[PDB]
Amino acid sequence: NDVVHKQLSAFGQYVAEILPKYVQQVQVSCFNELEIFIHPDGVIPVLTFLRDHTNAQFKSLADLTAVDVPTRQNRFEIVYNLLSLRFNSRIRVKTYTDELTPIESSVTVYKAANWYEREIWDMFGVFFANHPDLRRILTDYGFEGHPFRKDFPLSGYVELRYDDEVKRV
Amino acid sequence: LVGLAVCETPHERLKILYTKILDVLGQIPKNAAYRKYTEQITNEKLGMVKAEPDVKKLEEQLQGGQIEEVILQAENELSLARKMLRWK
Amino acid sequence: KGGRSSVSGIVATVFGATGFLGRYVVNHLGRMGSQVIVPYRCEPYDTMHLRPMGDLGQIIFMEWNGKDKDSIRKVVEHSNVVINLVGREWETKNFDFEDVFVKIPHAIAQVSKEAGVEKLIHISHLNADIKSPSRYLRSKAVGEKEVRAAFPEATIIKPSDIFGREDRFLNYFASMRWFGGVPLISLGKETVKQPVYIVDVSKGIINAIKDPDAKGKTFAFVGPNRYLLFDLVQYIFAVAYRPFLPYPLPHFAYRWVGRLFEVSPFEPWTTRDKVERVHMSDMTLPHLPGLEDLGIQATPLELKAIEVLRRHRT
Amino acid sequence: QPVSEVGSRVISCDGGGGALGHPRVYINLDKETKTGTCGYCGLQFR
Amino acid sequence: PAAHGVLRLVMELSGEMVRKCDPHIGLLHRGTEKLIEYKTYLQALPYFDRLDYVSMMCNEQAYSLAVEKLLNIQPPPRAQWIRVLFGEITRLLNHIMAVTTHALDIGAMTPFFWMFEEREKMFEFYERVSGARMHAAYIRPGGVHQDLPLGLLDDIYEFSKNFSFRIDELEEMLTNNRIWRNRTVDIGVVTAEDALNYGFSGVMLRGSGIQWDLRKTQPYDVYDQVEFDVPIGSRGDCYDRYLCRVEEMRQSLRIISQCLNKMPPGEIKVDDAKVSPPKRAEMKTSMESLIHHFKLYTEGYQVPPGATYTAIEAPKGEFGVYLVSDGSSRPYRCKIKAPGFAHLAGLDKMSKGHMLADVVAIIGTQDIVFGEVDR
Amino acid sequence: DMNEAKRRVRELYRAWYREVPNTVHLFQLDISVKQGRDKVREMFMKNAHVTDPRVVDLLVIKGKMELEETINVWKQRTHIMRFFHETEAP
Amino acid sequence: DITTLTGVPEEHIKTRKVRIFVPARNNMQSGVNNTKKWKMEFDTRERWENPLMGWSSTADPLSNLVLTFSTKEDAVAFAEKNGWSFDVEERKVPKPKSKSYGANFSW
Ligand SMILES: NC(=O)C1=CN([C@@H]2O[C@H](COP(=O)(O)OP(=O)(O)OC[C@H]3O[C@@H](n4cnc5c(N)ncnc54)[C@H](OP(=O)(O)O)[C@@H]3O)[C@@H](O)[C@H]2O)C=CC1
C-alpha cells in the first residue's frame, strides 16, 4: 500500500521537524516500517517524548534488540521497537555504541525494559547507565565471555561433566 | 479500564489541563516547531472543550475513546513540557 | 590434547574394578580419554556408574569368569595392557581364599604371555612378605611370586592400604563406634601403619604405565607419615567428633570375636583374617621402587580425612 | 540382470515407474562396442 | 511440579507470605539465536517449533510471515486458509494446556484428563497432515508444505461439532465451582495502563479491559474474512483471564466453522520455484525443476538484505520476530520476541505480599512457558 | 584516571578475603582455608597489568557480581570449586 | 586492549594468529561476488579422528569462526582492539586486460 507509506513518511517528517536535535535520519523501510536514528547520548530524551503525546503515544517496548557488527567505529547497534495503540502502528528507533562507552539504561522511559538491560548485558559487553541491577541471565554462573559477540565460538570454550574421583560436575 | 478511575465533570479539570499546558509551554522560544504544533492541536482541542459542554458526544469529538483517559494523556503532556525545556 | 575425546594407545583390562578399585584409575584413564575394557563378574547394575566415565565407545563391559581359562582369554584378547585387581578380604566359599590370590593371577599371567600382552601389572599388600598371621599376605605372596615367575617383566604394586572416604578401612574403624568402644589389643605402639590413598595411588598406577622405566620393578606405595595406630584412631574420632573409647583387650578374645562374626552368610563386618589385618604394622622399607620414583608426590592424609568421614558426623 | 536391448537408438531410463525412481535420463547407444549402463539405475542397455 | 521443571524462583519468604519472588530464568537457555545464524533460512524453521512448543504452529506462521515480507511474496489463498485454520487449532491447544495445567497446579487434577483426550485427537490431525504428532514443520516461508489429505476436513468437522460439549462441561466444573472462584478472583490484578508500561501482551492486556488485539487490529491473513468476538475482561484478576481463555476457545471454535465453509481449491505452495521447491513428479522430469530443487536444498534461497519485526497473535500473546537478512542465504540476526518474557518480568510487581500458594496460581495465570522465555 | 579505580579493587579484595572463610564454612568446601585466599590473590594477579582508564572499573563491575553470587548462595560448590581446575591433566 | 573483558582463555589470544585477507575466487566458478570484502580467518590447529565411526573429532575452541569486513584498516584495527596477532594480506585485483575479436584475424 502507498497510503501507509505516505502517512509514515509524513509522520517521519513530522517528528523530524518537531525534535531535530538528534534525529539523524528517518528512513522508511518500503514495506511500511518507519525507523529514525538516535545519537547514543540522546536515547532517554527521544524515547521519553516517544511515549509523550503528540501522536507518539508509542507505549510498550516490543523489544530491545542488540544487533552486532564487527566493523564500524562502534560495533554494537541497539534497537527499540515501539507500538502506539489508538493509531495502531509501530516504529523503531535505534542507536549505536562503543564496546566501552556506557550508554544509559532506558528502563524508566518505556517501563517494561528491566529484563532487557540484563539480557543485553549478559549477551554482550554493552553497559546501561542508571540501571538498578544488571546481572547475568541466560547463562551459567561464571561463564564470563558474552555470547552473541558475532565472534566467539558457538561451542564456547567450556563444558561440564561429572567426575567420580571428585564426585562432582 | 481497571486502573482508570471515573471522574465526573471533566470540563473543569480540562480547563486546568489546557491552561497548564499553554502556560508551561509558554516559556518555549518560538524557535522549535514543537510549540507550534503542540499549541496548534492543543488550542483546537480546547476550543472543542469550550465548544462541547456535554460529554456523551464530546468523546465523539476528541476522536478518542474515553476522554477520561486522554485527560491523563494531556497529563502526560504536562510533565512532557516539564521536560521540554530541561532539554532546552 | 589429552582430554575426554582424546585417544591414547591404552586398551587396559581391569578385572574387578567394581570395588574401591578401580573407579578412580578408570577415571584418570577417562580424563585422558584412553579406552578401557573393564569386565564384570558380578551384575550389570553395580557396574552402571562406571558408564559416564567413558566417551561413547570407550568403556566396554565384558562378561567373564576367573575360573575358565578362555573366559579370561576373552577380555585380554585385544588388550594392549592387562591389570589384575581381584581380591576379597574375607574369603567367600566358592572362591576359596587361595585361588583368588593364586590361580586367577596365574591364568592372567600366562594368558598375558600367549596373547603377547604388552604389559601386565598386579597388586599385593606391603606385608605380603610371608608371615604366620593372616593367609592373605601369604596367598598374595604366592600369586605375586607366581606371576613374577610367569610374567617376570610385570611390575607389581605394593600398597599398604590406600586412603579413600569410601575406603573399606578408615570407614571401618570409624564404624567401630557402633559396637561401643574401639578394640585395641594393647593400645599405643602395639602396631603402626601408613596409607597410600585413592587418588595418589591411582595417579601413580597410570603414571607407571606412563613410565618406560616401570618394567619388572616391584612398586610400593606408602603414606608420608608413620602414624601410630592409637593416635591415628584418636584422629579418626577427632574428625568424626564421635565419643572416643579405647577398648584394651587380651589378644585371643578379639579372635573369638572374629570367629563370632565370620558366621554371617552375607558380608561380615569383621573376620579373623581382618583380625590379623589389624594388629600387624607395615614395614618401613623405602629402597624398593615406589610412588615418588614415579615423580608423583603423596597427598597428606591430614587434609583429606574430613571429606572421607563427614558422613559419620552427627 | 540381463542387458536390455532395443533396435532403436536413444532410450529413457527412469529406474522403474514414474516419480518413484531416479530422474529421467536418456542413455545414448552410439557405440555398439559397449553396453549403455544407466547413470543411476545401473542397468545396462544396448 | 509448579516450577514447570525449569524455574528457580528463589524468594525471601516471611512466616509464609512471600516478600519478594526472584525469578532466575536461563535454566533452559538452550542458546538458539547463536545457532540460527549459522544455518540457512529453511534449516532454521524447526527451531521455532522448539520455542513455544505448546503452540507449535503459530510460531511457524510468525516466521513465514517474517520472511515473506522480506521476500516480498504472497501465498496462494488456500494456503492462507490452512495457515489460519491450524493457527486456530493450535489456539485451542494452548488454551487447553493453559487452563488445564493451571488447574492442575491448584489441584483440580480431573479436568486435565478430560481434555487431553481431545488434545490427543488434535494431535491426530497434526499426525495426519504433517506426519508428526507435534513439532510439525509444516508451515513454510513459501506458504505450506504438502497439501492436506482428502479425508481430513470431514474428520475435523465431526470433532469440532462435538467439542463444545466438552469445553462446556469443563466450564461446569470450574466457572461456578466457587472453591475455584475464591482461590482465583482477587489475584493478581494489574493496572490497565501499568500493563502497557510493562508491555504485557494478549490476554494479560484484555484482562484489564483494554480493547487491543492484533487479529482485529492489524490483521495479517484471512482474518479480514473471518468474524469472531474478542472477549474483554474487566477486573484483571486471574479469573477474568481464565474466562478470556475459555471464551477465546469458543471463538476459535467459531473460526473453524467459517474456514471450513470457505476453503478454496488451488495450489498451496507459491508458484515461485526460486523460493518453493518443485513438486516431486515434476523435478524428476525437467531440468530447471531439478536445478532449483537442488539449489534450494544446497545453498538455499537468498533474501534481500533488510530488517523487520513481524508480530502475530500467538495464543500466549503476540509473538515477535526481528530478523535481518544480510542478503546471504544465512540470516544475520534473528532476535525472537517472547511474549512470556515480559510477563514473567512483570510478575514480581504483580505478586508482592501475596500468599505463597497464590504466587503459584499467579505463575499459572501468566500461562508462561520457560522454553519460550529462555529462547 | 588510574589509582582512583585501584582503591576500588583493594576494597574488593577486602570484601572477598574476609568473606572467604564464610564461603568455606557455609559451602562445606574442603579446600584448605588458606588456599581460597591465595587463589583469590592470584586471580587478582591475573589482570595485574591492565592499564586502560575505563577498563579497570569495568573489571570491578565484573568483579562485584561474583562475590554478589557467593554471598547470596547463588552458584554452588561445583560452581565455586570450578576455579581450581583440579581435574585437569597437567 | 580488551583481553581481560573477553572470557577467552589466554592460549587463543596468544599461541595462534588471525589471517586477514580478501578471499580468492573459486576458480571453478566464473563468478566474482564472493571474492570481495575482507575476512578474518584464523589458523588451523589439530583435528584427529574419532576412534569410533571415524568422525573428525576436534579440540580447538574456535576453528570455524570467520568474519566479513568492508575495509582492511578496519580489520587490522579490529584485531588490535582484541589484541590479536595478524597476517594482513594484499587485495589482489586482476590487472585489466586488452581484448579484441579481430586480433584473432591479423593474418
Ligand atoms: N587400601 C586398600 O584397599 C589396599 C588394597 N590393596 C590391594 O589392591 C586391590 C584393590 O583394592 P580394592 O579395589 O579396594 O578391593 P575391592 O574389593 O574394592 O576390589 C576387588 C574387586 O574385584 C572383584 N573380584 C575380584 N576377584 C573376583 C572373583 N574371583 N569373582 C568375582 N569378583 C571378583 C570384587 O568383587 P566384584 O567385582 O565381583 O564385585 C571387587 O569388585 C585389592 O586386591 C587389594 O588387596 C593393596 C593395598 C591397599
Side-chain angles (χ1 to χ4, degrees), chain A residues 1-72 74-108 112-113 116 118-129 131-139 141-164 166-169, chain B residues 3 5 10 26 29 32-33 47 51 53 64-65 74 81, chain C residues 2-3 9 12 16-17 19 22 30 33 39 44 52 54 57 66 87 105 107 109 115-116 128 133 141 143 149-150 152 154 159 164 174 180-181 183 188 195 204 208 212 214 216 220 223-224 238 240 243 246 248 250 253 258 265 268 286 289-290 295 298 300 305, chain D residues 2 7 15-19 21 23 36 39 42, chain E residues 1-234 236-375, chain F residues 5 15 21 36 48 53 63 89-90, chain G residues 7 9 23-24 31 51 54 59 61 75 77 79 83 94 96 102-103:
Chain A
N1 289 283
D2 188 6
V3 175
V4 177
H5 198 193
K6 291 182 65 63
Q7 297 179 338
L8 292 171
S9 62
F11 184 79
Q13 296 173 335
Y14 180 75
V15 57
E17 289 180 350
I18 293 171
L19 299 174
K21 186 180 182 293
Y22 33 73
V23 289
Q24 283 85 3
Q25 60 183 17
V26 295
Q27 59 186 19
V28 174
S29 296
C30 296
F31 55 91
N32 301 342
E33 290 185 354
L34 189 151
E35 50 186 339
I36 73 104
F37 297 162
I38 294 175
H39 179 281
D41 292 341
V43 290
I44 304 99
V46 181
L47 274 68
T48 302
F49 171 72
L50 287 174
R51 178 161 64 264
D52 301 340
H53 180 55
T54 295
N55 285 281
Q57 53 182 19
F58 292 91
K59 296 178 182 298
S60 69
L61 298 178
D63 60 356
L64 176 62
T65 68
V67 174
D68 184 1
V69 56
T71 61
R72 294 185 173 178
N74 51 39
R75 59 190 299 180
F76 305 110
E77 188 271 338
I78 305 301
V79 173
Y80 295 75
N81 287 283
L82 292 176
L83 168 62
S84 175
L85 279 74
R86 186 61 182 169
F87 298 104
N88 62 348
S89 296
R90 294 182 183 174
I91 68 104
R92 178 165 57 260
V93 306
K94 51 185 173 298
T95 68
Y96 54 94
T97 301
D98 288 338
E99 298 183 352
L100 293 176
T101 191
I103 176 171
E104 303 84 357
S105 65
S106 170
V107 146
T108 77
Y116 295 72
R118 322 178 53 196
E119 177 190 5
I120 298 177
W121 167 260
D122 197 9
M123 293 294 104
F124 298 98
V126 294
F127 178 87
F128 291 168
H131 181 66
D133 187 6
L134 291 177
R135 58 181 180 186
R136 55 171 51 80
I137 65 172
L138 293 176
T139 56
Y141 292 101
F143 182 76
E144 301 306 322
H146 313 291
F148 295 165
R149 299 296 296 281
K150 181 56 181 171
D151 59 352
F152 171 77
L154 49 78
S155 298
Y157 302 99
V158 289
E159 177 187 3
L160 278 71
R161 67 175 183 84
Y162 181 73
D163 193 357
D164 188 8
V166 68
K167 289 183 66 64
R168 184 178 64 257
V169 301
Chain E
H4 304 295
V6 283
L7 172 60
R8 184 174 178 265
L9 192 148
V10 180
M11 70 198 101
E12 73 286 5
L13 55 80
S14 177
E16 193 171 3
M17 299 298 183
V18 66
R19 295 193 182 282
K20 178 179 287 182
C21 50
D22 182 8
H24 298 293
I25 62 105
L27 282 169
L28 195 141
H29 180 60
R30 43 173 57 96
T32 301
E33 296 176 350
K34 188 66 179 295
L35 288 177
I36 297 173
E37 294 173 345
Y38 295 88
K39 298 183 177 76
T40 181
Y41 287 83
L42 190 142
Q43 295 176 334
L45 192 144
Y47 286 91
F48 289 151
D49 299 347
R50 312 286 181 267
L51 291 179
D52 186 6
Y53 46 87
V54 178
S55 68
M56 67 202 82
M57 287 295 185
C58 292
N59 295 133
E60 295 174 350
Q61 193 165 355
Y63 177 72
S64 294
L65 268 61
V67 167
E68 289 183 353
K69 282 166 58 183
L70 267 67
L71 197 65
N72 186 25
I73 180 173
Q74 181 177 354
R78 182 182 187 173
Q80 289 176 331
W81 288 102
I82 294 171
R83 290 159 73 94
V84 65
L85 175 61
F86 283 89
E88 296 312 320
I89 286 178
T90 304
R91 191 63 57 83
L92 290 174
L93 264 62
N94 185 33
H95 290 88
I96 285 175
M97 177 70 178
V99 178
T100 290
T101 58
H102 172 51
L104 181 66
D105 293 343
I106 66 173
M109 185 182 76
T110 296
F112 182 87
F113 300 92
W114 288 356
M115 299 309 298
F116 280 185
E117 173 60 14
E118 298 304 323
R119 192 166 186 270
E120 192 284 334
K121 287 184 172 72
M122 306 172 80
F123 285 171
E124 181 174 357
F125 296 160
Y126 287 160
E127 168 69 17
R128 192 172 185 173
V129 294
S130 175
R133 300 187 71 252
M134 71 182 288
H135 288 290
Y138 177 78
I139 291 170
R140 295 291 184 191
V144 66
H145 193 60
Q146 300 177 341
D147 183 1
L148 53 82
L150 270 66
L152 179 64
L153 286 180
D154 59 351
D155 187 4
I156 293 173
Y157 179 79
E158 182 177 0
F159 152 71
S160 61
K161 62 177 291 181
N162 301 136
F163 177 82
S164 177
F165 303 171
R166 297 297 173 271
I167 182 172
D168 190 5
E169 296 179 352
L170 184 150
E171 186 174 5
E172 289 183 351
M173 283 192 71
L174 296 179
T175 300
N176 290 340
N177 187 338
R178 188 175 294 178
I179 299 172
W180 195 93
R181 290 178 61 84
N182 293 286
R183 189 178 178 85
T184 58
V185 66
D186 192 69
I187 54 175
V189 178
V190 292
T191 299
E193 65 180 346
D194 192 353
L196 291 171
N197 185 28
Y198 281 88
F200 285 163
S201 60
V203 173
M204 281 296 298
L205 292 178
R206 303 184 190 87
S208 292
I210 67 102
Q211 297 294 98
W212 180 260
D213 186 5
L214 281 73
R215 292 179 298 176
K216 300 294 283 188
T217 299
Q218 298 173 336
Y220 41 80
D221 290 342
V222 293
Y223 286 101
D224 297 344
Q225 299 176 339
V226 299
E227 295 82 357
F228 62 95
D229 290 343
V230 173
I232 305 303
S234 66
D237 53 350
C238 174
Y239 184 68
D240 289 348
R241 303 171 194 167
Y242 160 81
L243 276 75
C244 291
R245 301 283 173 75
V246 170
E247 185 64 16
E248 284 176 348
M249 290 178 68
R250 285 190 169 92
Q251 305 306 102
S252 178
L253 182 57
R254 179 189 297 174
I255 303 298
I256 298 168
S257 67
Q258 299 178 338
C259 294
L260 291 176
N261 291 283
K262 57 185 296 179
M263 183 68 179
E267 73 170 344
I268 44 100
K269 294 175 183 296
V270 169
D271 281 338
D272 188 3
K274 307 294 175 64
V275 176
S276 295
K279 59 176 65 181
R280 299 297 296 273
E282 184 179 4
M283 64 168 278
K284 289 182 180 296
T285 185
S286 66
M287 185 67 187
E288 303 84 350
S289 300
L290 172 55
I291 294 173
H292 296 294
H293 170 70
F294 183 80
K295 290 302 290 183
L296 259 63
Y297 287 97
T298 59
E299 183 180 5
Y301 50 80
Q302 296 83 2
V303 179
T308 193
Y309 174 86
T310 56
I312 63 172
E313 184 66 13
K316 301 183 184 302
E318 68 178 342
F319 188 79
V321 181
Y322 179 75
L323 55 80
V324 292
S325 179
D326 57 354
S328 179
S329 295
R330 300 189 299 182
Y332 183 77
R333 178 67 165 86
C334 187
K335 177 61 162 59
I336 300 168
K337 177 176 177 289
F341 186 76
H343 297 86
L344 178 57
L347 180 144
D348 180 67
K349 180 173 180 289
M350 178 172 63
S351 174
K352 290 190 297 183
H354 291 287
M355 176 59 72
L356 185 144
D358 288 342
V359 65
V360 171
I362 199 169
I363 292 170
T365 185
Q366 293 292 95
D367 69 26
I368 62 174
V369 54
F370 292 86
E372 188 173 9
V373 171
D374 286 348
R375 295 192 297 275

